[PDB]
Design an enzyme around this catalytic site. Sequence first.
Site, PDB file in Angstrom:
ATOM      1  N   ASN A   1      -8.998  -0.638  -0.755  1.00 48.40           N
ATOM      2  CA  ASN A   1      -8.314  -0.719  -2.040  1.00 48.40           C
ATOM      3  C   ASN A   1      -9.296  -0.364  -3.164  1.00 48.40           C
ATOM      4  O   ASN A   1      -8.944   0.311  -4.133  1.00 48.40           O
ATOM      5  CB  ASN A   1      -7.804  -2.141  -2.278  1.00 48.40           C
TER       6      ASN A   1
ATOM      7  N   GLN B   1     -11.206  -4.910   0.016  1.00 45.74           N
ATOM      8  CA  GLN B   1     -10.717  -5.677  -1.113  1.00 45.74           C
ATOM      9  C   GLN B   1     -11.756  -5.868  -2.208  1.00 45.74           C
ATOM     10  O   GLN B   1     -12.960  -5.965  -1.941  1.00 45.74           O
ATOM     11  CB  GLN B   1     -10.237  -7.049  -0.644  1.00 45.74           C
TER      12      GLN B   1
ATOM     13  N   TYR C   1     -10.672   2.450   5.253  1.00 44.95           N
ATOM     14  CA  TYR C   1      -9.517   2.170   4.416  1.00 44.95           C
ATOM     15  C   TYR C   1      -9.896   1.100   3.392  1.00 44.95           C
ATOM     16  O   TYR C   1     -10.317   0.007   3.767  1.00 44.95           O
ATOM     17  CB  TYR C   1      -8.370   1.699   5.305  1.00 44.95           C
TER      18      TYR C   1
ATOM     19  N   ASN D   1       6.117  -9.601   6.190  1.00 46.31           N
ATOM     20  CA  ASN D   1       5.082  -8.708   6.689  1.00 46.31           C
ATOM     21  C   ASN D   1       5.001  -8.881   8.203  1.00 46.31           C
ATOM     22  O   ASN D   1       4.418  -9.843   8.692  1.00 46.31           O
ATOM     23  CB  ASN D   1       3.750  -9.062   6.041  1.00 46.31           C
TER      24      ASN D   1
ATOM     25  N   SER E   1       0.748  -1.254   0.000  1.00 46.89           N
ATOM     26  CA  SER E   1       0.000   0.000   0.000  1.00 46.89           C
ATOM     27  C   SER E   1       0.779   1.306   0.000  1.00 46.89           C
ATOM     28  O   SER E   1       0.175   2.382  -0.040  1.00 46.89           O
ATOM     29  CB  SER E   1      -1.002   0.009   1.133  1.00 46.89           C
TER      30      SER E   1
ATOM     31  N   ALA F   1       1.904  -3.437   2.888  1.00 51.50           N
ATOM     32  CA  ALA F   1       2.158  -4.850   3.097  1.00 51.50           C
ATOM     33  C   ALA F   1       1.507  -5.675   2.003  1.00 51.50           C
ATOM     34  O   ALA F   1       0.455  -5.312   1.485  1.00 51.50           O
ATOM     35  CB  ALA F   1       1.614  -5.285   4.467  1.00 51.50           C
TER      36      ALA F   1
HETATM   37  B1  LIG Z   1      -1.961  -2.117   2.034  1.00 54.33           B
HETATM   38  O1  LIG Z   1      -0.642  -2.822   2.044  1.00 54.33           O
HETATM   39  O2  LIG Z   1      -2.545  -1.782   3.288  1.00 54.33           O
HETATM   40  C1  LIG Z   1      -2.928  -3.223   1.472  1.00 54.33           C
HETATM   41  C2  LIG Z   1      -2.470  -4.104   0.535  1.00 54.33           C
HETATM   42  C3  LIG Z   1      -3.245  -5.109   0.043  1.00 54.33           C
HETATM   43  N1  LIG Z   1      -2.683  -6.094  -0.954  1.00 54.33           N
HETATM   44  O3  LIG Z   1      -3.286  -7.062  -1.247  1.00 54.33           O
HETATM   45  O4  LIG Z   1      -1.568  -5.974  -1.368  1.00 54.33           O
HETATM   46  C4  LIG Z   1      -4.569  -5.242   0.509  1.00 54.33           C
HETATM   47  C5  LIG Z   1      -5.050  -4.349   1.457  1.00 54.33           C
HETATM   48  C6  LIG Z   1      -4.204  -3.337   1.930  1.00 54.33           C
END
Ligand SMILES: *[B]([O])([O])C1=[C]C([N+](=O)[O-])=[C][C]=[C]1
Length: 358
Positions: A149, A117, A147, A340, A61, A315
């Site tokens: 995506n 997601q 939050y 992670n 992210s 992550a």
């Molecule tokens: B972010 O890293 O918070 C993030 C990333 C992903 N991903 O699948 O890479 C999903 C949700 C948040």
Amino acid sequence: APQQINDIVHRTITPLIEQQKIPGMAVAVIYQGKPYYFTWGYADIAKKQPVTQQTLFELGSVSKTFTGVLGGDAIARGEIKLSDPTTKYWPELTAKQWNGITLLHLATYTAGGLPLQVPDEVKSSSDLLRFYQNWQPAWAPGTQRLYANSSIGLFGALAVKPSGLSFEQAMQTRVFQPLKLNHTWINVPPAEEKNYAWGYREGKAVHVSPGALDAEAYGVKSTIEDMARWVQSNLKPLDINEKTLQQGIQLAQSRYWQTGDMYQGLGWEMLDWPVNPDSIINGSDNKIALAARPVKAITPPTPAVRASWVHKTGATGGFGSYVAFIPEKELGIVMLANKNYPNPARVDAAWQILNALQ
Ligand SMILES: *[B]([O])([O])C1=[C]C([N+](=O)[O-])=[C][C]=[C]1
């Protein structure tokens, strides 16, 4: 590197790698505008390949900061407006619930409950349209932050439409190249494969899986050197040659919403400095960073505030990254790992190092 920086860094990161069992790590500290690099462990445990300043890490992210700035650059170009309804860029979004949802709501996670997601089942552009058309908001726009995506991801895909360029194309030509991020990719080319580190999840080597809006929400891969330039660019935007990119960076660091003592920018998240470590550290845990929180609009948005702690965690299944900088102090840090591990651990280490350097 000055003994001072060298000591603070090793004293902090060594036990971190040991406690968290991190296979490989790259760290860059930007002190008074200049970067200093540190590397530990492996990029590939099996082939015994070390982590170097050329190793590529999945940013997860942290990619959203790139998307926010690209979006900010498109605004500076006059190609889009954050005040525009989403349907202005996706006319096929007929569902009435899309009524008063603007690009701002999308970019800042305040659309009304769009999911974190995008379902794995959504594979086509038609699948994506159906997904968004059938989505039922939980709240009115601009009232709650969740939050997601699927929120910022859509903002990225839509922001580049006017330009007629693909997302990767616009990112490369409007952001990567002007900033000289010559080793930052959405799709790592064959020639660079050998530098692509493996991510590790439960002892298994892994790379991020393909998915809808992956490029726009979590798909950038980069090196510690390019990430340091990324941070330098965000610390001193007025030094960037491109007019619209300079402005775009400043727009991504503006404060549009407030939740607790956290402010939401475009991709980037901010807090006032000096900052209570507990404010950030505790707010990072993925039990508070992902939850539903009411927002207060800042009207009009506050321009980039120099006295801020600007950061973003990222992550993927096998990587953990973190970026943080304080413009007023010309201070910053980048931590890239192929594991992670807990966010609080990241913020804690970053704070210790940065606090020590003033
Ligand atoms: B972010 O890293 O918070 C993030 C990333 C992903 N991903 O699948 O890479 C999903 C949700 C948040």
